[PDB]
Amino acid sequence: DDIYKAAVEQLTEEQKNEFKAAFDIFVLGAEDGCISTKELGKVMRMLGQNPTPEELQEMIDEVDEDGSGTVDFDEFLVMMVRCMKDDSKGKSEEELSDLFRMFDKNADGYIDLDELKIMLQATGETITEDDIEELMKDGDKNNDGRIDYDEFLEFMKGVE
Amino acid sequence: ISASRKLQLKTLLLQIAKQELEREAEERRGEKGRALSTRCQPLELAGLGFAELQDLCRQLHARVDKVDEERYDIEAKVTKNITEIADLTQKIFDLRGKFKRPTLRRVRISADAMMQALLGARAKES
Amino acid sequence: DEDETTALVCDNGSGLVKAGFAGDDAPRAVFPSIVGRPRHQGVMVGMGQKDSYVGDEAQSKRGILTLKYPIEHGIITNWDDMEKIWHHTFYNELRVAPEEHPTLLTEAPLNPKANREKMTQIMFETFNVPAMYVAIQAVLSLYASGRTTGIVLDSGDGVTHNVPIYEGYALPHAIMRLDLAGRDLTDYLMKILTERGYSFVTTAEREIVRDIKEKLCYVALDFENEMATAASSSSLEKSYELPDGQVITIGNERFRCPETLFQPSFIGMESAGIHETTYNSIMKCDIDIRKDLYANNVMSGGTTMYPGIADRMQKEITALAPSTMKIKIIAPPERKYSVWIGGSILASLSTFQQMWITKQEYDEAGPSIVHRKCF
Amino acid sequence: DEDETTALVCDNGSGLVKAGFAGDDAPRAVFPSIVGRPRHQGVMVGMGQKDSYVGDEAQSKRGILTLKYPIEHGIITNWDDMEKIWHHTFYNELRVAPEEHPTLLTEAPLNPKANREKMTQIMFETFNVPAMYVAIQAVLSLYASGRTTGIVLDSGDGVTHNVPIYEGYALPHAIMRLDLAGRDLTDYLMKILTERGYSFVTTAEREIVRDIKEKLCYVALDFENEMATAASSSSLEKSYELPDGQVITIGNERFRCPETLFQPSFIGMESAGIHETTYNSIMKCDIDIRKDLYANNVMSGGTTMYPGIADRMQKEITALAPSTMKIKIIAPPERKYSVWIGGSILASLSTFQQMWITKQEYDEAGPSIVHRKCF
Amino acid sequence: GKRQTEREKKKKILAERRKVLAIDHLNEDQLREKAKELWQSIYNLEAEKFDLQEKFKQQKYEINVLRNRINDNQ
Numbered sequence A: 001d002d003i004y005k006a007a008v009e010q011l012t013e014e015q016k017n018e019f020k021a022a023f024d025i026f027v028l029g030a031e032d033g034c035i036s037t038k039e040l041g042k043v044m045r046m047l048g049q050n051p052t053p054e055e056l057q058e059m060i061d062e063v064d065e066d067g068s069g070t071v072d073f074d075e076f077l078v079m080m081v082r083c084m085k086d087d088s089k090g091k092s093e094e095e096l097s098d099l100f101r102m103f104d105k106n107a108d109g110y111i112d113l114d115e116l117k118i119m120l121q122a123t124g125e126t127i128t129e130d131d132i133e134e135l136m137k138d139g140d141k142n143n144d145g146r147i148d149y150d151e152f153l154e155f156m157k158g159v160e
Numbered sequence B: 001i002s003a004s005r006k007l008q009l010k011t012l013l014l015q016i017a018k019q020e021l022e023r024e025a026e027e028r029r030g031e032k033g034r035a036l037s038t039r040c041q042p043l044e045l046a047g048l049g050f051a052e053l054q055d056l057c058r059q060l061h062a063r064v065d066k067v068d069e070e071r072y073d074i075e076a077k078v079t080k081n082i083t084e085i086a087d088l089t090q091k092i093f094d095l096r097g098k099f100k101r102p103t104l105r106r107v108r109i110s111a112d113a114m115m116q117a118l119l120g121a122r123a124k125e126s
Numbered sequence C, D: 001d002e003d004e005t006t007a008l009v010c011d012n013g014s015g016l017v018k019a020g021f022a023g024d025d026a027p028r029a030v031f032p033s034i035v036g037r038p039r040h041q042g043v044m045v046g047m048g049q050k051d052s053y054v055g056d057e058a059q060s061k062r063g064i065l066t067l068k069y070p071i072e073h074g075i076i077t078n079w080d081d082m083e084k085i086w087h088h089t090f091y092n093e094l095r096v097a098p099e100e101h102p103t104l105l106t107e108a109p110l111n112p113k114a115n116r117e118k119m120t121q122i123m124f125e126t127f128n129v130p131a132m133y134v135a136i137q138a139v140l141s142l143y144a145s146g147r148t149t150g151i152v153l154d155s156g157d158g159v160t161h162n163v164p165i166y167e168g169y170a171l172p173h174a175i176m177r178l179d180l181a182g183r184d185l186t187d188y189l190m191k192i193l194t195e196r197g198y199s200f201v202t203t204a205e206r207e208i209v210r211d212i213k214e215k216l217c218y219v220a221l222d223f224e225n226e227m228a229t230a231a232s233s234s235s236l237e238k239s240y241e242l243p244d245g246q247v248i249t250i251g252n253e254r255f256r257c258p259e260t261l262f263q264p265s266f267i268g269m270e271s272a273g274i275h276e277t278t279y280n281s282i283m284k285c286d287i288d289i290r291k292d293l294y295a296n297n298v299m300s301g302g303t304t305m306y307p308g309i310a311d312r313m314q315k316e317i318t319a320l321a322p323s324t325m326k327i328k329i330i331a332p333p334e335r336k337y338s339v340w341i342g343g344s345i346l347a348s349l350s351t352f353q354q355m356w357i358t359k360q361e362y363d364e365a366g367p368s369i370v371h372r373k374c375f
Numbered sequence E: 001g002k003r004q005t006e007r008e009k010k011k012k013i014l015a016e017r018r019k020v021l022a023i024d025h026l027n028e029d030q031l032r033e034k035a036k037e038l039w040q041s042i043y044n045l046e047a048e049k050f051d052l053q054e055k056f057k058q059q060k061y062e063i064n065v066l067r068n069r070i071n072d073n074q
């Protein structure tokens, strides 16, 4: 999600205005102003594609943040950036392995909170406590408080 | 924090890690230079006569055999580590296998083609 | 978008052809393995009209065409017709020329070698593909399902192959192929619908009965209970709409068609059915293999799409199986398309690139090379 | 991972290698002396899959492997497989680097010198051990048991050595080397289970029968009474679960197998039997020794764990023994593990610190040094 | 057979890598060049040894990470 959310933040106002015009086509006549599988299917067919009901439900589930079963405009912008890549290929595991070693300052095999904090400060961006805590919670999937090698690869998946 | 902020931090984190990797390589090259200065010191040939030069060549040749044996010994340890790395890599892959085979979809109609079809000439920035 | 010389993937069966690009998760389109030909004398001129029609063209213009299938009971019998099926698949709908892409074609484990040899020959000689590989459908089904181990029960349109795999290895002595498949089930249905007063024999009619089967059959986990009621009351009949506005209602015949998979004698086949071949593939494997195969019967092919077959199969295998043992069925949404999906998985593996037959290897050895390099 | 340069101890039998470090009272793990190899052709791509599996890997993946042991009645004949077993033992599970530790291995005193010379050679030449010792299994069980005197009866998986020791001394003229062990008992059981309708031939089946014997069998204090009863009533049957959910029940076969130890003729062997070889090792010793060996019939290894064996062996010797003499079996819980345990004790004795072959002594002396320094 | 071969083999390899030197047909100037050539060979071997030592350290790190991943995923 994070790489796509960043791409959305960076869209210009004119680009968002064009996406809004497209969104309005998709939700024309919808009871709640949102895109359900009935509006998504009618547009995909209008576009020449023939998705199954399951494919349509999965396209919505991939960006549905509230659990509405529908796509709102904010969710739509994520759908539209996900449908395109600037970040093609996305590197690979061998390159992430060498980068992992650079985060692991004590060479223990894990990235701890102090290591993460040192690396974040080095970026030059203002780092708040919330930036540190949130990235470590996003990375450490087993709740030990550290990022292992396999968690690091999931953590940096798709990051250019 | 927004996911958009997290991405920017992750992209900058990877850029610094890459810089540190280059830094490590440069430092290792410096370390290599110094190690070689100690292990393989320069020849002093001035003043050696013919017989002394013949003995030096024999002495250097003998050293070549000894260094090659030391190199062999480290190489053997490196070789054993490759076998272990290959076996552990297969083990982790299998432990981390199960239900995780990945897929891609083509339901993701490119937003460029979609925008040209739905908006026509209105579609200029996207 | 395709900005990389990705391998092309196509599964060519006796029924339909699944095709798309490696790296996608579905065929882009499914092209029936049909070449249609006009069977009437023309009167108007300047009407276009082809010598032959293919895939969806063959079905769209079928009102006056006889429709032939180049593939039967698992093999290609007419490879000149397949060159046209493939040409259309690649150049008209996928809009890709194989000349710039490796191509992956698939077959059953004991499939006659002529099938893989002609698949290899046509793609190298008429399409000039830079590389070829013929894969095993059972591998691909396991790849789509997230398995390395299980019984692949692949009843399709022309054949049921039935092949056990353990840790990625075939157990060939435990393969039990049957001449029992969806095409025969269609024929069984045509005969019993004839008994009801709806006699279907011509191409248009044969295609209708196939369509009826696909939409109305539910197989029945308990067929004795279903025949007792379905044959006694209209409350279990389903109405089907025909192209000319006619309606046919089907009762116990609705499940008697699929029943042939459990009672093959219905179509003249000497067999114990699909649930027993699944079971025998487990039983001919060693006892330290059997436990994993019992827990992983893997559904592939198309008969796996009846609303009730997973229960019909689990009930039959567990009935044949020893007690204590846990008998399970793996029946993912990747149903009917698991070979194509597996094809995309295989084609895109880094561990598969050395397995390709290159055009240079082909030109030096000829098509028999596929028999030596693939499996 | 050890914090001291403690000697390593490994008991390499035809069955399992017991291994751990000196100073403990048990091995860290038991590593079956098995190297497995796939016996099938792979079909799926990207499955990993190695040419061979070792120890517990060999048993865990056995469903498609052929499993072989490198040790034949106490002698290693397949050294490639033992290097894999030893490497796995130190490298993955004991978490040991032999380069930093003396290593003690064990062996029957009656085996060909080739085995003790080669074991000395591999630890010094392949594992770079700083020191070596190969110890006698009669000695090792006696140390573990707290004894200096007795007849040590292994009845193991590989060999029965039948060796009398008095006041720490060997009495070699009284030794009965016997070619009868658990590996033969297992084959006998497979033939009599075949008589019951359960045919066990292949590796999975051979490992099942060895498991059946280990969990269901006994010798019987009185064979004929158990024989007549078990042959007459189901009350003497015991069940076993086969891995595929099927079951087997075993009747008099439950004891007919173990009985071969007392009756070697059951497998075509020409032998006195373990109770007579034990007896003859006492009998052939001097008249003032006999009384101490009668009172010290010492168990070693496995099979000494069978119900009725400690009571039966004492009765069988008593029946052959002169009156006045008091006959006793020493059957400690340190059973099936006493040889390894003795190795731990021996390696650690202050009186044994000079018995170790050092690397320098080995390099100067050559492999024959084991004959001058160990036994 | 094979273990003896492995011990003989490391020595055989090292013997194979031993070149034959002769210093009698060479004059003083050629001997100085020959000495520089042997020195450079030693230098290159020491440089290769250094690279292997560095690799060995990265390998120990990688092995420790793999062991931790296995222990955490088991």
Ligand SMILES: Nc1ncnc2c1ncn2[C@@H]1O[C@H](COP(=O)(O)OP(=O)(O)O)[C@@H](O)[C@H]1O
Pocket: C011, C012, C013, C014, C015, C016, C017, C018, C155, C156, C157, C181, C182, C183, C210, C213, C214, C215, C217, C300, C301, C302, C303, C305, C306, C307, C335, C336, C337
């Ligand atoms: N819901 C269904 N009910 C009954 N039969 C079905 C159903 N879905 C597919 N089939 C049949 O399965 C066969 C298609 O098998 P499939 O594996 O998906 O294509 P192929 O073998 O050519 O790759 C056809 O005979 C089709 O009529």
Ligand SMILES: Nc1ncnc2c1ncn2[C@@H]1O[C@H](COP(=O)(O)OP(=O)(O)O)[C@@H](O)[C@H]1O
Pocket: D011, D012, D013, D014, D015, D016, D017, D018, D156, D157, D182, D183, D210, D213, D214, D215, D217, D300, D301, D302, D303, D304, D305, D306, D336, D337
């Ligand atoms: N409880 C038991 N019942 C029957 N046989 C046994 C039992 N325990 C051990 N044995 C047998 O003894 C052997 C294992 O004992 P062990 O001496 O530890 O082998 P090793 O010499 O390799 O260390 C096997 O053949 C096993 O069948």
